[PDB]
Enzyme design. Structure first.
Site, PDB file in Angstrom:
ATOM      1  N   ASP A  34      48.872  26.393  53.507  1.00  0.00           N
ATOM      2  CA  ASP A  34      50.097  25.711  53.909  1.00  0.00           C
ATOM      3  C   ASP A  34      49.924  24.197  54.064  1.00  0.00           C
ATOM      4  OD1 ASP A  34      51.149  28.376  54.147  1.00  0.00           O
ATOM      5  OD2 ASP A  34      50.182  28.467  56.116  1.00  0.00           O
ATOM      6  N   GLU A  65      60.675  30.764  51.118  1.00  0.00           N
ATOM      7  CA  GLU A  65      60.131  30.209  52.351  1.00  0.00           C
ATOM      8  C   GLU A  65      59.604  28.807  52.068  1.00  0.00           C
ATOM      9  OE1 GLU A  65      57.508  33.385  53.048  1.00  0.00           O
ATOM     10  OE2 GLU A  65      55.872  32.600  51.811  1.00  0.00           O
TER      11      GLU A  65
END
Ligand code: CA
Ligand code: CA
Ligand code: CA
Lengths: 536, 534, 532
Positions: free
Chosen positions: B14, B186
């Site tokens: 991430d 997402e």
């Protein structure tokens, strides 16, 4: 006097039976439900009423994040030297080849009086117990756990000497017993009667193989010799017996010279067509592990259960008059006072302004929107035990959610992966609707989400109700209190049981409760006028 | 000028990329390892060094009891109005049809702190992102979760207006995008360039189907129209590409005017004989989800990855000077602070777990829970960053019963690890044993015949050699001659590819541990801890 | 006199006990092993000897393609009107929520034949029984199966009148019993003693809950009243009893006026550390379901097992003098030793030959051990927990699909197999294959054991010791080498394998296969079975 079993109905396992003069007390385990430990009092061994929920402060019991079927396991409640002694275990791992936990000792002169700060008694195992020998010395028993100490292969009972003046445990451990082929050796209790020390343990696991095994010895540290029948109590060999899983005994002599043993037991419901001794054929127990009592006779220096090894529904009571304290039957909390009714419990954490309030709107229980029912952290859930196979639970709710993540209503709950929940939420197109969510082996079931039941805009209240009837139960709603409508979904009550769920967790019991959540975290609240529990 | 991926090796997913002037920063997720969030710095986008572990106190991050693969999910680090903004999620449920968690915002005038106390930003989902528009207004994005909102069927990207002066979020949510057939929409990020808003999402899930997807709209609230190729980055269609699972992008324009995107990716090890497209044929990733970066070119107002959608090992570096140049590591435990390469599980490192002050020059570890506990483990571990390396330590330990043990562990989560330790046996003395949890199933082949330790052996050296698919423990009593523990362990089992479940890929760790199941009290001392890659 | 149980050891379930005057016979099920049905003889009920394998023609028993644990289920051997009567079932579906099969009747004027061609008796169920009433009429019982008739919820016992002169059955079915909560009601037999009809059934299933249930009635069509104790035999309540799974009884009154009951039973091996009543804790049975016998006493018109409900190692024998009657087949004769059986199909020239090379059993190369069609496998039962099996083999394969050797076999998905093959770069090698819950295990294919090119014979050997067994080999017959793989003998049992198949028992035998179909053959000089 005739005693009907179970004496403690619903989720009430591991009875630790003691007495102070003519007053008798039983402590049962509460697992992840807060506050920890439930103590019941009786003067006749037939009628019991809750008098104490001792572990009601986070400084004594910090169970946030605890796994399902963690927390308070078997407690030991004894009385000696002018005060009660309460040993308890806070278990932190469950779904693992071995577990970790913490054992603590708290004391109090009176059963309801404030309990002292806990004394750490070690972490090496579970089922702690404190024996007060006649010479003033004290001994702490437990069953060690860890790698290879979950009957793979080991299951032992060890003993450490305990100094009460300093609260110290001696580092030496003496193995008292290593178990019979039944194994699962646990729940050790020591007694001294006649010239003998008696060691009582549970074996066979706490399901249908549960048994009470007794040994005896001349010196406390052994060697111990088995009861001539090995098992003193068990119902494994009687699969049609009404009471099953009869084990984890607690022997006590009354002030009248008579002998009684409290034990845990379950009442199974069976599915039609399933052979009795096939898998699942012995039954499912939504009321979980409950507490029974048996009269004990003595023969040639050995104790026996009168009538046989098996748990009987009716037993002979002691030579005292019946002295009931509480009225039996219906139950209801109208939320008119300062405290929740003591039959209500929270999940892991204490009830406070985080979960709800009884003063924000007097006459109502206000629950704030927090986590959903699958969370081991902060649920605003207030629930009570299933204590009968046929009953109705009902509430009147006022709720105004603004999006799909705010909901509130009624729930039948076993653990975080097995429950059902009929609630009011907000849907972006219609408005307020009633939906249902069920978790079954952690698998979701939400058959009303595509076409939910509309809640009228002018409806000030939404009545919710669950009707439990043996194997099944259904939810019903109303917008006026008089005319009711059934939610067209039938739920399996037998699935709210460890017999169905399985896993490494142990059988607790089904609950019914009030819940309000806000996954959004925006903030909301649901007001509940009352909560009722009416047996058939 | 030439950047070799991954730039952040090991457990580093991430990657939220931002810049302050000519200084560039990337924040990575840390899940249940404490402290939370890892921020790396660079001035050439090629050579990166860790500079901050911002969530380093319980009031900012309280993860005791968190489930495996819970905790810190995708962070977002940005710079605006003279300070750094850090959004993060503390996830509290993992193994469930839907999850719960908490979002927070902390600020700092400079990357090394001081960091604020957390401001609650709601709990409605994950992958939070803060967008600073050119007109001074701020917008907050996230993926709502809950029942029927884990791609069953819904996966939405919603937006709330944020008032920075009071930290208030407006109750109204605006849906920006509902996803394509790839689903798992997402990691939303907003950018304003040319006369367009650009919305960047991740789709297909963070495994081999991972993809980056870009949309654009004239206004911020939509409606957004899709990229011509929908997917701007993915390596799913090249099952032999070195870098896999390329997705969850972080776009940034440099101070030179160039465009670069940080993304997560994995380097799988394949078992022999397994067909490539059969189950487990694409490989196993013991180094977890790492961080890569790629150069972005623009055509017709749409962004593209240079040379194709896939993630390449080498990319063209920005138009800045290369700084001097994943490496050899060791901690001799001289200072009063743990090496920032080391982390604990869920809880901070205080005197409950150990002390670097009680015995100077040694890491003292106090005996608490075993490695399967989500509460109080005295465990200090660092990242696997190479497929071939050796970890080593010198330990002093003298237990008194079977529930006291201490040693070396290769760890993925509470149900998947191996542990080579010294304990006590009543009739023998100090012994060396091994315990492995594989899919929560235990292996302990040395318990019925353990390796004896001499009575006056002051120190036991422990060492693990990792060689791609396998790894093996070894011990010493002198520091000179070593002996092998005759157990070969599978390194490809310390990976989400093998474990499965609803948790997401983190990465293998190697670390030091000491426990006392009895709670009587013990402690182990470690002189050093070396990580030597081949 | 003291009888020691089991009287029939190894794979020997469903004992049907009959008598012709002073000669007693017991027929046992054989499932997919050919020939079908094994009939043992005794004159004292203590010492038993195999005397007849009657279902030895494909026209009587056609089992090619039969599923594992299919084939011959519980038979009924009876003697009446000057001839023996044999009912049997050929079951064709096993792994399914319900099953199909075929019931047949064959007769014979003597115990060793000639056996007539089969008469069809219906396909509606299993455990067929023929009751010969004292008035001359005959009745045919069975437990119906089908959808919802595998104790889900139904388990019935039905009766049809049999007309012997025409060999047909009345289409009407009378239900005799519907079962107690133990369910799994099966194995029905009728008896007429004193002024009562007695219905004997098995209940609880053929695992550790097995039990013999007895009912009685004044007329043959009932209604029947349960025995005062419901169960007349069971050992379920005694988990440490040496004999377990004691059920499926066959009552008989001797010519001495005494009463006995044959029953199936099992002797389990227990793994160390496993709790006694946990899953798998009651044991694993590599010898399968064997046969015992118990002495019966009568008390107020009801039968009881002497000493208690449970099965005992030692019982009291009848009032007759004792008349008693290691193993090796040198392959010297026209026939295999009757202890050896094949799978489903008869042993003929397609499988092997005893005349191609006199003195050797030559096996030809067909399917492998996982096939339900045509394997050249010849095997005998495990009858002891500790034994050694040995053979001397001559075999020269030419590629990797030709192999031959020694196997320990339970069903097509559970076996081990040590063999000689040919590897492309080496020559003759020795390898092993294990199927464990149908999962393959071949730890030697990467580094096989080389065979000397001029070794004319390769000796093979298996040593079984309770829970584990190991293979050994030799090239001279005197110096032996172990194969470094230890196999679990307890896995060769229905307790480990599970599934809807029923417990048979472990076998050990000789095997040769040619997956290529090119054509190969292996010669075996002998086959030994030597218990400890
Ligand atoms: Ca009220
Ligand atoms: Ca040092
Ligand atoms: Ca010969």
């Amino acid at each position: 006097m005739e005693i009907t079993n179970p004496i403690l109905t619903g989720f009430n396992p591991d009875p630790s039976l003691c007495r102070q003069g003519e007053d008798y007390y039983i402590a049962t385990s509460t697992f992840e439900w807060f506050p920890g430990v439930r103590i019941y009092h009786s003067r006749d061994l037939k009628n019991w009423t809750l008098v104490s929920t001792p572990l009601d402060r986070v400084s004594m019991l910090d169970m946030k994040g605890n796994p399902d079927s963690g927390g308070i396991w078997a407690p030991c409640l004894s009385y000696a030297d002018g005060k009660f002694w309460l040993l308890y275990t806070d278990v932190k791992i469950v779904d693992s080849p071995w577990k970790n936990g913490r054992n603590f000792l708290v004391t109090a002169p009176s059963i309801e009086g404030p309990w002292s700060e806990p004394i750490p008694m070690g972490n090496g195992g579970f089922d702690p117990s404190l024996f007060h020998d006649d010479d003033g010395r004290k001994y702490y028993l437990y069953r060690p756990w860890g790698p290879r100490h979950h009957s793979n292969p080991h299951n032992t009972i060890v003993m450490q000497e305990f100094d009460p003046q300093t609260g110290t445990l001696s580092p030496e451990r003496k193995t008292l017993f290593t178990g019979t082929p039944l194994c699962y050796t646990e729940g050790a209790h020591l007694y001294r009667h006649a010239g003998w020390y008696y060691l009582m343990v549970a074996e066979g696991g706490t399901s249908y193989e549960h048994a009470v095994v007794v040994l005896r010895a001349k010196t406390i540290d052994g060697p111990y010799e088995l009861h001539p029948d090995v098992t003193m109590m068990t119902s494994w060999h009687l699969p049609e017996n009404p009471l099953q899983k009869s084990g984890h005994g607690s022997l006590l002599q009354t002030h009248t010279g008579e002998w009684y043993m409290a034990y845990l037991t379950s009442r199974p419901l069976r599915l039609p067509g399933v052979p009795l001794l096939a898998s699942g054929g012995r039954g499912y127990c939504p009321l979980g592990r409950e507490t029974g009592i048996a009269r004990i006779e003595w023969r040639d220096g050995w104790p026996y259960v009168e009538g046989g090894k098996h748990a009987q529904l009716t037993v002979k009571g002691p030579q005292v008059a019946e002295q009931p304290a509480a009225v039996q039957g219906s139950w209801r909390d109208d939320f008119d006072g300062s405290t929740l009714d003591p039959e209500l419990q929270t999940l892991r954490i204490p009830f406070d302004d985080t979960l709800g309030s009884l003063t924000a709107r007097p006459g109502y229980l206000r629950l704030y929107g927090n986590d959903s029912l699958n969370s081991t952290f902060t649920q605003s859930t207030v629930a009570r035990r299933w204590q009968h196979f046929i009953f109705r639970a009902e509430t009147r709710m006022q709720f105004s959610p603004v999006h799909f993540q705010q909901s509130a209503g009624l729930t039948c709950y076993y653990n975080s992966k097995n429950w059902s929940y009929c609630f009011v939420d907000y849907e972006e197109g219609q408005g307020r609707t009633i939906k249902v969510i069920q978790l079954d082996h952690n698998v979701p079931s939400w058959p009303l989400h595509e076409q939910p039941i509309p809640v009228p805009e002018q409806a000030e209240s939404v009545w919710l109700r669950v009707d439990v009837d043996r194997l099944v139960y259904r939810y019903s709603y109303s917008f006026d209190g008089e005319t009711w409508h059934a939610v067209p979904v039938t739920y399996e009550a037998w699935k709210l049981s460890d017999d169905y769920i399985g896993g490494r967790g142990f059988a607790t019991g089904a609950f019914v409760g009030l819940h309000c959540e806000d996954i959004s975290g925006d903030g909301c609240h649901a007001d509940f006028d009352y909560f009722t529990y009416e047996p058939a």
